[PDB]
Ligand binder design. Sequence first.
Ligand SMILES: OC[C@H]1O[C@@H](O)[C@H](O)[C@@H](O)[C@H]1O
Ligand SMILES: OC[C@H]1O[C@@H](O)[C@H](O)[C@@H](O)[C@H]1O
Ligand SMILES: OC[C@H]1O[C@@H](O)[C@H](O)[C@@H](O)[C@H]1O
Ligand SMILES: OC[C@H]1O[C@@H](O)[C@H](O)[C@@H](O)[C@H]1O
Lengths: 989, 989
Amino acid sequence: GRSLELGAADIQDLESFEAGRGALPARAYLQSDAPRLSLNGEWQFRLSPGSRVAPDDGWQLGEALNGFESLPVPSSWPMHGHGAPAYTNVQFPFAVEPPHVPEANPIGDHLVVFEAGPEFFPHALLRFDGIESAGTVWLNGVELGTTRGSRLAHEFDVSGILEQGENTLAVRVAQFSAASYVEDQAMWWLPGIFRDVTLQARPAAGIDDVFVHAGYDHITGEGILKVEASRGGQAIDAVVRVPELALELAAGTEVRVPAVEPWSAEVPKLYEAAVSAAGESVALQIGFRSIAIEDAQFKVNGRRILLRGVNRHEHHPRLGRVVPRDVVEAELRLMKQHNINAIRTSHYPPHPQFLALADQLGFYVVLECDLETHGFESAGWAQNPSDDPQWEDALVDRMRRTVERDKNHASVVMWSLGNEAGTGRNLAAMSRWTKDRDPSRPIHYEGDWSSEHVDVYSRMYASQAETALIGQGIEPALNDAALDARRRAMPFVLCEYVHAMGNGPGGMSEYQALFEKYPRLMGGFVWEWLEHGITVSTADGVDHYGYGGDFGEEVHDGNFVTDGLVDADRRPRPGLLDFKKVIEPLRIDVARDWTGFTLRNGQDFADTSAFSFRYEVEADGGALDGGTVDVAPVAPQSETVVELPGSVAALAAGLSDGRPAVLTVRAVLGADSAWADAGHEVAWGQSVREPGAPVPPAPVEPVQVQDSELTLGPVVFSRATGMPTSIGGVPVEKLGLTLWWAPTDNDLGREWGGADERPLATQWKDAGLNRLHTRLLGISANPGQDGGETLTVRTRVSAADKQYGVLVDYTWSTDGETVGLRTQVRRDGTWVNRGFEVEWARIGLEFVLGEETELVSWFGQGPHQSYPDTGQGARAGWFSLPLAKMDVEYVRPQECGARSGSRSAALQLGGRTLEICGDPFALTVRPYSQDVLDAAAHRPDLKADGRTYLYVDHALRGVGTAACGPGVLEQYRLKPRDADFILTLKVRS
Amino acid sequence: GRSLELGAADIQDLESFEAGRGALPARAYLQSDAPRLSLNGEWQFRLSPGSRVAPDDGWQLGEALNGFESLPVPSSWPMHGHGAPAYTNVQFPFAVEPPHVPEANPIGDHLVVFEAGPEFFPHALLRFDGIESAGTVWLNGVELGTTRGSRLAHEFDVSGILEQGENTLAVRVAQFSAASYVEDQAMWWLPGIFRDVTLQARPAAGIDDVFVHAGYDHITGEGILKVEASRGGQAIDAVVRVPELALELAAGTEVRVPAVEPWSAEVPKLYEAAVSAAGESVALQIGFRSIAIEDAQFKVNGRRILLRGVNRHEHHPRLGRVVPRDVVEAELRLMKQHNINAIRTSHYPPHPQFLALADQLGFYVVLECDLETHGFESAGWAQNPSDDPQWEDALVDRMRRTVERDKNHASVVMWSLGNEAGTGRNLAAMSRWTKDRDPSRPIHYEGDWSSEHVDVYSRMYASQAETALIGQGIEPALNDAALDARRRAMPFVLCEYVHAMGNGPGGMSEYQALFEKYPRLMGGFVWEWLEHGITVSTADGVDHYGYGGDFGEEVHDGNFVTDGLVDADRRPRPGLLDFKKVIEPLRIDVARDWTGFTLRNGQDFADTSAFSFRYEVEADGGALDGGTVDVAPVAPQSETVVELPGSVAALAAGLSDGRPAVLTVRAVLGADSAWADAGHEVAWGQSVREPGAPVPPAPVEPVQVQDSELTLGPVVFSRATGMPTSIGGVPVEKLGLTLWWAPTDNDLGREWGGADERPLATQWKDAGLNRLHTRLLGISANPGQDGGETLTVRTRVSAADKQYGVLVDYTWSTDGETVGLRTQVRRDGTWVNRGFEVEWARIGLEFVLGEETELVSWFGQGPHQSYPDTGQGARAGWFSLPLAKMDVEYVRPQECGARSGSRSAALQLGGRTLEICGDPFALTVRPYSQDVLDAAAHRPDLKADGRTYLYVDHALRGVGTAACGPGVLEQYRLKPRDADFILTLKVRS
Ligand SMILES: OC[C@H]1O[C@@H](O)[C@H](O)[C@@H](O)[C@H]1O
Ligand SMILES: OC[C@H]1O[C@@H](O)[C@H](O)[C@@H](O)[C@H]1O
Ligand SMILES: OC[C@H]1O[C@@H](O)[C@H](O)[C@@H](O)[C@H]1O
Ligand SMILES: OC[C@H]1O[C@@H](O)[C@H](O)[C@@H](O)[C@H]1O
């Protein structure tokens, strides 16, 4: 049996169950004075479709290069025209038959030439901080070894192989390997050398690894310091210095520092330090803090903390898995600016530079190992690597490298074994290894609800209801009494919650109230921080984001990648603006009589000395009063009542009733910080004096009659239809009832529970809410006042093939100045379809106007959108925006931009202005129709058609988080019902 | 309360529950010598969007016409650019709130000027044979009345209103009315005056109505004749004459004719007749036949008959509901040419000219009333007009007019109350009325399974299994013993079965065998005769059919309209070719030794004297023998063994074994008939001498080896992939396994039963059968014979995210002339997905070739396609066709064109020819890919890409009728399994 296949040897290596070979022991990423040369820059690159046709020519030596072109390094090579991105959620892009790999497997050959000076001898190494997913490395033709673990560091000794002067480094990178089976994160598949490549010397009498142990005794205030140092795995002599604390001690010994200032996300105190031996010195930043679990609470420095967190993937719209440092610093400052205090590195270790920034700015970090086997769930977890003993060594290695690299950073308060990888013996081995190596950080893993091998109980997307049961410690018991006992003593954290995809997330406040009420609840991490949008440039310079499927992939999960609080360029979504308010660290309850406000300090450690408390009274015209009030600092977890100047209460008392006015109290930064300038807003509260009920016009104008038209003051009606065609000279091309909106991403998902497995969008489509039809029943003019008349138009709205409907009556009235419009809705028949009760998106009206709108003004909530279960961040005030800025640039267009709680509005159409008033309504204005919005898959598919689509809603439905997790909560649902609402219009030129 | 709405009076009339007003009594359509003038021609026409804007100007008088243009009459006015067609299946296109109508309701004003000569006085009438759906008629400004019942005749007296000379006739037609609620047939909605408009004089002493009663005593052979005649509802004096029978008798008296030749679809004997009084004479055609039910059988003239039927809608691709007479005669001849003997006028009376043609050519007709309320089912039948007493008069009227018009035609053997209209008191009133008026024809209605008010038990799409239970009279009992007793004594008919949508129908033979075995089974009517395709002409002159949705309708049911045995232009689909064979009236079983054949006469009345029995022996070269054999006529329902000339058996006996040869016996017409010429084929049978097993080549050629290629005789392989790239100079761009085909219309429907409600196409999509991926495992050359070698390529086929797969091994061998190819398939893992066992469409191979193919030849079954549960009409022989004629022009492209039972094949590519041989396989050749075929929604979306896609299948799955009714029967399913098949190839230039 002759064997004639090509590349069988390269494939066997890619199919290996083992960790990479030929590498130095795993250690910490350390700032050293040892000489170093970054090989980052312009490399040469060649791509083959698979191993069997990957040329075995002499390319590794660098001479006679055939078929190479320039490429930057680090890089995600699909970001530069070589192949294309492919995004899948749970599903693998290849056949599930481990350890085998497909035949279509991009192979990337990388090569660079560099100069090695004398200072890199006799000893040196090469360091690779990230290769996705399988790398083989040669130096001057000699093989160093292989890399496994795509976001993990590898180091190769080049002593006696690195030559003085010019050297040639070659790296072969395969996209898919056996390791892909354990790297099934929901994100873009992006092969490449995507992190630093560095040459580092290792002088004699140096330092290879360091392990900081900096604890805090919260009773005495002492610091407990012990800095370990080793060479070749052996503890060595070395001296530690921290100038600020008047300390010089030996490595390996534990000392009590009489008084330290503890480290926390709120106060990230960092003492500079150096560990030095004869040949090498290491620069450290040390944060004193101790982590402990007691009374079923997660405590730092003796206090239960509340995690205000997000899940952070690493992604950049033009460079993929390469995130420039300027972008890292930016987004982390942006996080702090929105009151975030915690980060989960979903689902792999980040760039090693991330850790120091986290220590400095202040975040509680859950550092997570690179491991996820989600794609094995659909087959009942059969062949899951997490329980296959042949994978033990490879998975322990992943955890080892994860722990060693970042074990010195005070910001890491939990080690996480991975994400959605089931349960198995290998996961238990990873946990046992970590607990032995570093018992100073509790262990996290959500995949095993029994929680046998962890220290905190973690779940994702648990309902508000179950969260409250857990907060009270009365969730259902595990069958094993011993394991149930353990878990009931564990604090609870939501590693992912309030899925922030598209319009939403809804129901954040409900979670937060539980967090504040129940100590056992640690808090939660929003999924997720950013949208993984990829910029696509088109003809005429139009720029938009692409998502799953837009790059010609055979298997994908669509727009699930754009599920973030900010877009790929870090521009806030409305959800982040709401999130900031929900998690605000201070609560300000302004008194109704404007005499003062209650101030609760929600922080865990800091008092209120960093904040300046300011007040301002705003009214119709401008601002009437304002200033700053001094507050004796308030301790954490306590409250006080702050008096306001009597002048404020006097304004309120002498306010002619019916005049609108808003008192706003804010807590801003008194001075610059590392993450924001002075005056940055942190918390706020308001008290509103509402405008009185709008005076309904006197019906003293009669109805003129003609053959095909009616007129009632500034309004013109069509006799045939009964609907306005003009108001004050403004063409009304249509007016009608609305019960539907263009489905959100959440409306496109299932609400599990109940016998109805259809998404809300499908329920609506089956019911006909998107294609309503109106029948005219009657037109009638009725006696008004002193000659005038009202005009009642009676209609019935329904849909083809349906028997249910609603009766809508429009009653118009006018005095010549302002048009009054009453609308009555009455449901007719039983609103059931395919055996389930139909629900409504809204109860409102759609005005279609023939003119374009330039500007929208309103008194209500703003500046940004607000729906019944969102809008926490929208405050009471006066707002005005150009039309285009009323919209929201979601990647898949969908319902958005409604302004709930509006009392008045004003649209500028050319030279005229249309004013709407009435009891609280929601306001939306768009230059396109609802059907155009529902059809559009990307922003370019939206086109203005010269009209103005105006929406005035009396009732609205919530948005929820049904795309992943709970749907709209009961209190925000909208069942069919009768309704009645009044409204006044006016046009002025 | 002033009332200001427009058109409220016209709308109230459209909402009327009552029949049309002001019309003459319902009567028969009669050929009379009274003067007549057809007003058909070029009319003037105007369209308004609704009643409220329909002008009330002076248009009815004909002077100062504003906005009218020319339009033909009769017409379906959406067929001429006024609006557009809209097709819905079950669902109404308007809100379901009877009797109300929508505001978007096209109003069509029609007008013509004509001359009335002296012979139209003093009495005359105007006759309208069809107006959809509500007409108001004026003559010279004077209102005559209104029409209700869209396919029913109305007559209006114009005495004292018709003026001598020039007259002006005006008709206002509304598309939607209260009557639309009872005209919910599955078809295009097409308003208009779509049938004849005729002026007819009514001289004094004339004849208004006639009622023929022509029975047959099958014991004596006597005819029982009684011709009734009436004027103004009163029986009158009149004399009846039938020359051929030597008869002159008075109307109203019953006589025994000593000897008549009975009428039947097989022998449609018609005696000419005339009923005459002083002023008028009527021409009649009389067929003597008596209908009776006894021993739970449906009998004509004392014999149980077998219905070979189709459901006939009226439709024309360019004129809509207007079917020219030349097209009627054509399609009915086409029906007879395919052995059909029965017609159901689904679901309304046809054009009155249809009846005479049915009497002449010979069909058993189920004449069905215009009534269907299907759209009320989705709401639990609430508000169903069939049980609403306010609709009684309007529904009795529909049945009255239905019965009166056609009561004289022997071809009508059943009256049908309507279709899918539920159960209700009005349906019972329609039945009571019919039984009293005409007790000579049993009553049919499927909507009430209890069968309380009918004479035959009717069902639609009952499984073969339930049909067999009913054939034995052991179906489950009704709860009411008295009704169960009645129904068990009733014969059973399938008014709709073997849904003929797209590829199919499958499972026809199984039904037919039950029809022949069980007397209680009357037979069945295929759904349906024609596709309702509408021709759409595009730039460059390309012509294709449109279906539901292609005309911009808001609500539609897609391609369900193209569900016919022939296309809109009456070109046969493969299903009709199979249907003809299944229902063939004679069975011919040719003996294996070629000594003779068994002949069963399946007819009910006629013997075999009309047929000439002919034989022919065909072989490789040409024909070897042939002739005609004389058969003593065989009586109905008996059989005989016909000897063939000894010369035929001698050829078979002296045939060198392994040589293929086919003996075919045919029954053709001995002489011309009214529906076909002499030599037309009616029945056939065959005996085949198969070719011997193909000799596998001697493996005496070795494997040449190169860096990137292997070669084994005329074959070139790629070392990387292991797959052919050449055979004899022909580029092979790809070769691989197939388990999937582009879903048929049947595959897009649900198979109710079992916990899996997904259509087969969705099951396949979820499982990944459409996106298979192959991994190379090994390549190996093995010792052959006298130096030669075999080449085994080992592969594993699967799909992304799936663990199941198949192992496919290709073993090649050659002697230099012919390539031998063995293929072994072994399933690997459990083929389950989303909790249900995956099924396969096929087990085969796809050859993709770089050259185009001009011609395809094969020995097997043809000329037309054949799948496991179809192809009855495909016979054994030798066939050759240009590539384009191997395809099938279904309106929605889908899997089709496979040739099952193939033993050899030959493709001509330019100058060369590729030959395939082996054990029985299925052959398909296309100029495009399977994905292009699945994506295409219409024919133009198919584009040849310069390649040749060749499919060789070892196993195939059935097609069934799951689009509506049973899916693939158990024995034709294809579960995943191991398989093995051999095959030889050869290229000759
Ligand atoms: O103590 C106040 C601060 O608390 C931090 O945890 C948060 O990240 C900051 O944005 C700020 O709110
Ligand atoms: O092994 C994976 C499973 O683990 C269980 O603890 C959990 O309840 C399941 O939902 C699933 O995640
Ligand atoms: O008796 C033979 C004939 O029977 C008729 O019913 C049929 O319509 C004809 O096509 C032919 O088959
Ligand atoms: O009233 C309509 C119903 O009539 C019943 O006899 C039948 O079983 C049902 O399927 C439905 O057709």
